[PDB]
Amino acid sequence: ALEWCKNRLEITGRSVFVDIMQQWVTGEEVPLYRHAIQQSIRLFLAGCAGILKPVKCMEYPPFPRLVSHGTGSAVASNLAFQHWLDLLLKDAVLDGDTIRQIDRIYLQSGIASVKWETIPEGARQIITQLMARQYPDWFGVASWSSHINGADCWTKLGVMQEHACNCDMLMIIPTRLAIELNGNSQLLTGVSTTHDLYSHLYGMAWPSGQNIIWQRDRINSLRLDFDSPSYPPSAELMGELSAVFDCEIRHWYQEPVNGIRGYDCYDRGDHVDSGEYGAGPF
């Protein structure tokens, strides 16, 4: 049976920072990065339809179907698509900047204002097929569906989600564009999968936690417990947590079956010490 790791956190200081972090823990904040990737899917779909084309002549080697309809008058819609192609080609993080630049370019592309059947026949053939085929990665579902409704799917992808899951870590070390679009598939040849990036960035392939329980302990003070798959989040990530939230994070972790236990302290981005797991007391 897959064994889960118990993490316990004790955090401090400073009232206003432990408030924004509590929001992180509760998923109150909006995950702007999800806006970037849902916009990138629509851009990617549009480009495959040919209802957005490059203006420079250029390749996209991982998926030449993205640019198979040629060029490309010099209008705003297709000028924004080039800038998007640039980001995609560099597999852009995902910070930023590169979020607020993915909806600037999304703003005229002008594809927010499709629209699903003013689109040719034609384009609908192609978009639906890609969505069907990439459905479990783009739509957070286990399995392909025997039927999909193009209009609904194309709609779903236009509606930005407004709350993030609890302890969403993609808020903390950013993910990257081409991979997100590849999800766990082999759509994009040569491009890595989301499973592999997460492993590398966060030290676990699922960058969140479950069985989240917490306590505003004192106004200077937050206690967080949560379960992670197999392993605790990386030092790298935990380090970043405490920089992002300008806090001191005391981290106790334990998975009995593989004998991983430990203690690490992180302070304002710095790994201030580690040790043996004591315990440190609920």
From TrEMBL:
<dbReference type="Pfam" id="PF06924">
    <property type="entry name" value="DUF1281"/>
</dbReference>
<protein>
    <submittedName>
        <fullName>DUF1281 domain-containing protein</fullName>
    </submittedName>
</protein>
<feature type="domain" description="YubB ferredoxin-like">
    <location>
        <begin position="211"/>
        <end position="275"/>
    </location>
</feature>
<dbReference type="InterPro" id="IPR041329">
    <property type="entry name" value="YubB_C"/>
</dbReference>
<dbReference type="Pfam" id="PF18406">
    <property type="entry name" value="DUF1281_C"/>
</dbReference>
<feature type="domain" description="DUF1281">
    <location>
        <begin position="30"/>
        <end position="206"/>
    </location>
</feature>
<dbReference type="InterPro" id="IPR023136">
    <property type="entry name" value="Api92-like_dom_sf"/>
</dbReference>
<dbReference type="InterPro" id="IPR009694">
    <property type="entry name" value="DUF1281"/>
</dbReference>
